[PDB]
Amino acid sequence: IKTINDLPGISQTVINKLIEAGYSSLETLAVASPQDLSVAAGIPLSTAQKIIKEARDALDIRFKTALEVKKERMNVKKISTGSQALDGLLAGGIETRTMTEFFGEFGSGKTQLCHQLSVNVQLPPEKGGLSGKAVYIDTEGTFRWERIENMAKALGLDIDNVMNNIYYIRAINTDHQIAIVDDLQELVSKDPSIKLIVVDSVTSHFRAEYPGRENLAVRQQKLNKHLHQLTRLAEVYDIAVIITNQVMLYHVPGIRIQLKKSRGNRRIARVVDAPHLPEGEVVFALTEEGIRDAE
Amino acid sequence: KTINDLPGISQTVINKLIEAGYSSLETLAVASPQDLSVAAGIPLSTAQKIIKEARDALDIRFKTALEVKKERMNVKKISTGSQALDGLLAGGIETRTMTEFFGEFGSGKTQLCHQLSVNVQLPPEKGGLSGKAVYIDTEGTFRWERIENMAKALGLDIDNVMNNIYYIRAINTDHQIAIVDDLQELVSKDPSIKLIVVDSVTSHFRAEYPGRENLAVRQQKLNKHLHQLTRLAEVYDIAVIITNQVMAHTLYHVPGIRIQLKKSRGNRRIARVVDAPHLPEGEVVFALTEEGIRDAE
């Protein structure tokens, strides 16, 4: 589980005293001292040691054998982000048969991330990829054929071959965005090499062509349908769908990661929504080489 | 393009589609045959067709990232300030060609002209062409202030910005004509100019040749004037923008590209491609800010 509010045998009254004391994340609780938590939250010592137990337990730490672990890695295939940190957070990388969302303020690293993945995807399972192609649906004109270049170089790959494996299409508005997605089903069947679908800023045009709280219902109706569509595609055709949303509540997306800007080059990525992923934030950086770990 | 051009479709339904509010193909391409059948009062079987034929009509082609990059070094455009509007115009106002912006008073034509008479000076990295502009002012619309604000928002030098904009009042058609004539010198004297802006080209003609009595000659003259500005843009590799103020059988027009602007909820505005060879039809929305021309929300 995630979030404190979901802590077992816990009163909803202390849940405040915990968030009023600055204890928002479970991983922060998991390692706190019962004593200091008792004093800082103004809660009975006996209960501190409990929410800390419940919190640590919520992390799901499992000491597997080196063999058993090796077994599970061949059992599954993911695209690596380029940052072991971020990968770890994501239990390996971007999964197929599923849609992952990356949301956050402008410049949090969501774009770079999209590009980065539109390249690693082409790499072989040994180096972090899936020997496949990518479809980059460009919603707001963010694609930097330059950024794909640097990323490419640093990998010792062939710039032009890299660019040749990235299907590109600008989506000028919702109607076109919807259509483009609709014709996707053919593409994937026409070229089963495709493994990565990237729709940067999916919600974007909708908030634009359906502004205000007056359209809220239709905006969601239309968007949810657009998303339920991309999800299926990913599932049926065994590929990974990635979408980024740019924010500053009844979501469809499977996995949701939030990105935040940190001291200059650095950035933080946290698992918000996810069924199989354990909560926690990790730190990575935006380099020229691409998406790497900090320091 | 356009609905009346839909294959195997009766001209009878073409009306129930325009009377139901389905003007553009892109609106059809994503509608529900079901709802379309109720809204237009058309056989369910015909709806799913109009939509099939409509979706096909959008011309969706999944090009390779490489071929696209090739097309970018091949051409250079001026950015409108709204990534929306630029998307609609496949990058921006193109050179070697004339683009018209027409619409009711306040649709954003003016703002747009000013915004372009500044973005033109920006370097290719920021969306410009590191060039100057000629602003032929037909009805006294230039706002030395509006250039200022737009200028600031770009962290540019007010003074310098204004020094890279050639300005000239064109009091009547005859002067408008002369002015354009002498343009050939200017562009040759100063090859840095890259944006010609004639706001309200048709204006003086409609005034000096009013009524349905002169319409023929009014257009004979105006079209000759436009063919003129077009050539200039082509020959001297620059961009000519003209704006026309209209209020709201395939009619003949000279202008390469034509976009219609409409007012929307207060701040917002809609821009749609009407005439265009290489531009795919569809309307997008943008807004009028103090900063200048930007996207909405």
Numbering used by the authors:
A (entry chain A): 11 to 258, 277 to 323
B (entry chain B): 12 to 259, 275 to 323
How do the authors describe this structure?
Here we report additional three new crystal structures of left-handed helical filaments. First, the basic structural element of these three new helical filaments is a RadA dimer. The other protomers were then assigned as 2ZUB_B, 2ZUC_B and 2ZUD_B, respectively. A unique property of these left-handed helical filaments, as compared to other known structures of RecA family proteins, is that their DNA binding motifs (i.e., L1, L2 and NTD) are all located at the outermost surface of helical filaments. Moreover, the NTDs are separated a long way from L1 and L2 motifs. We found that the locations of the L1 and L2 motifs in the four left-handed helical filaments are relatively conserved, but in contrast, the NTD locations are quite different. The first hinge region, located between the NTD and the PM, is referred to here as “subunit rotational motif 1 (SRM1)”. Subsequent structural and biochemical analysis revealed that SRM1, a hinge region between the NTD and the PM, is not only responsible for structural flexibility of the NTD but also is important for RadA's function in promoting D-loop formation.
